Amino acid sequence: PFDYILSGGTVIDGTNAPGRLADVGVRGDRIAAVGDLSASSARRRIDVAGKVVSPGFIDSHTHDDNYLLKHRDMTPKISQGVTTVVTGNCGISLAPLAHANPPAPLDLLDEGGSFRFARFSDYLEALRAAPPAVNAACMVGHSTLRAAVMPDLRREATADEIQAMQALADDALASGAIGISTGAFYPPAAHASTEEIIEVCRPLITHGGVYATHMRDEGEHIVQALEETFRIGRELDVPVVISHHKVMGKLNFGRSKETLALIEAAMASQDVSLDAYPYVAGSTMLKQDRVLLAGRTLITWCKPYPELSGRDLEEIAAERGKSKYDVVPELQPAGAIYFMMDEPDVQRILAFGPTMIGSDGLPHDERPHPRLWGTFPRVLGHYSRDLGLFPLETAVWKMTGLTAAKFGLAERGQVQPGYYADLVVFDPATVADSATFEHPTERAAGIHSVYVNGAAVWEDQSFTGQHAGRVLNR
């Protein structure tokens, strides 16, 4: 007998096909059958009339590396329907690095002495021993590797340093990492050359991993950063993933037409993917950057002046007699939300066929960007249902089947017999992001239940206690 059948709903199977009325039967960690399952014995027949049963959402872009260890419930993600998270993005991974005060933005993963894993395998073993509620597909970050190896980060790595970083990257991939990410936009890697990145990432071809990147620039010089990314992909001969695609700053509004045309052209000749979050504000370390600071900026946390969390930076700066750019050093280290994108570009990037959905949630932030709690339902409700940006099955595909294919997560991302039972039951009519910039941790509406490897992890608007997630390999 099946352990249970989710009966009477509409299955949106993750393959970008209109939903169909069908039941879903689960046995252990697998989807056993899909269709009219009235004739199949089951221990429970759960009524989901009026709901959609879809694959669990795969968050293509997270910074959950440490959150998986410290808050195993993973409530910000499972409450939105997420069943798998891709970690170690933008060059920032929790491991391998033993450091009491890692350089920003590595601090976005730190709760205080969290960087304690000398080897990447130590980190994966910790996840397997005390599993989180969601599956984890983990990358190693090039900035973490630089911090672990280089005594001076403000220059290109020497061949000896490249050798040491490449050995750590190869060990991480051998241990189960699914790829390597970079983020040369940030201080720890701003002096890394394209050739340094290529040499450190060479093992990806041998291990079958992916190259993910927070591009060197996402504003005035985004074309040069895109070209750098495509060149790295051709040299490595592995799939590239462009993280949180955007055009930032007023001088770049509207340029998503141009960047998407360059990405589409590259996709015809090499393997390229991209993801995005559904919002017009970004969030990361507080940084002296004229573009990030041009517009409205909110503080998410601040070490030297904790009371500034949640405050408007223009007010803080003006009261200190300075521009935002000039006041930043005295407030560091800190985090911020930056309103530097324009809605038409966000919509164009979300609608572009290949764009996968990634939350870019920063889970340790005191006053976080709402994308941490509302990304997936914002796409299914606000964008698909309310604005008609894409039909519901395409919105679901962009957070399930597409993502599983691009990251190589076998037997996940689709409601198919034999695949793993990572599933979401949601109400298409009411699914919605509740988190706002003012109340960024509100739980999404319309998420009935979430299952990971067949175990319910979210039910009755609460974590069930099931630590069902697994460390995944590509």
Specify the residue, 90 or 140, whose C-beta has the smaller distance to Zn ion: 90
User: Total residues at the site for Zn ion (CB under 5 A)?
Assistant: 3
Length of the chain counted residue by residue:
474
Q: How many whole angstroms separate alpha carbon 141 and alpha carbon 143?
A: 6
Site string for Zn ion, 171-210 (x = CB under 5 A): ----------------------------------------
Q: Which range touches Zn ion (CB under 5 A), out of 81-89, 137-145, 312-320, 436-444?
A: 81-89
Contact by Cβ (8 Å): 272, 285: no
Query: Is 63 among the annotated ligand-binding positions?
Result: yes
Q: Which range touches Zn ion (CB under 5 A), out of 85-93, 221-229, 343-351, 394-402?
A: 85-93
- Of the candidate residues 6, 42, 90, 148, the single one contacting Zn ion (CB under 5 A): 90
- Beginning with the edge strand found earlier in the chain, give each strand of the sheet holding 30-35 in spatial order: 30-35, 23-27, 4-7, 45-47
CB of 214 to Zn ion, least distance (A): 3
Query: Is 467 among the annotated ligand-binding positions?
Result: yes
Of 409, 418, 395, the C-alpha closest to 19 is 395
Binding of Zn ion by 89 (CB under 5 A): yes
- Beginning with the edge strand found earlier in the chain, give each strand of the sheet holding 462-463 in spatial order: 20-21, 10-11, 52-55, 423-426, 447-452, 455-459, 462-463
The angle at the Cα of 371, spanning 367 to 376, to the nearest 5 degrees, equals 150
- Of the candidate residues 207, 214, 216, 348, the single one contacting Zn ion (CB under 5 A): 214
Query: Is 439 among the annotated ligand-binding positions?
Result: no
Q: What are the C-alpha distances in Å from 107 to residues 93, 144, 170, 271, 344?
A: 10, 11, 24, 32, 32
Query: Is 365 among the annotated ligand-binding positions?
Result: no
Q: How many whole angstroms separate alpha carbon 253 and alpha carbon 104?
A: 28
CB of 418 to Zn ion, least distance (A): 33
Of 42, 55, 48, the C-alpha closest to 22 is 48
Query: Is 360 among the annotated ligand-binding positions?
Result: yes
Query: Is 199 among the annotated ligand-binding positions?
Result: yes
Specify the residue, 72 or 287, whose C-beta has the smaller distance to Zn ion: 287
Tell me how crowded residue 39 is: count the other CB atoms within 10 A of its CB: 5
Question: What value does the CA radius of gyration of the chain take, rounded to a whole number of Å?
Answer: 21
User: H or E element: which one contains 175?
Assistant: helix 159-175
Cross-strand pairs, 6: 24, 46
Site string for Zn ion, 331-370 (x = CB under 5 A): ----------------------------------------
Query: Is 191 among the annotated ligand-binding positions?
Result: no
Query: Is 315 among the annotated ligand-binding positions?
Result: yes
Query: Is 170 among the annotated ligand-binding positions?
Result: yes
CB of 43 to Zn ion, least distance (A): 42
Q: Which range touches Zn ion (CB under 5 A), out of 8-16, 87-95, 338-346, 349-357?
A: 87-95
Annotated binding site for Cu(2+): 61, 63, 90, 360
Annotated binding site for Zn(2+): 61, 63, 71, 90, 111, 170, 195, 199, 207, 214, 237, 244, 315, 319, 360, 382, 386, 467
Q: Which residues bind Zn ion (CB under 5 A)?
A: 89-90, 214
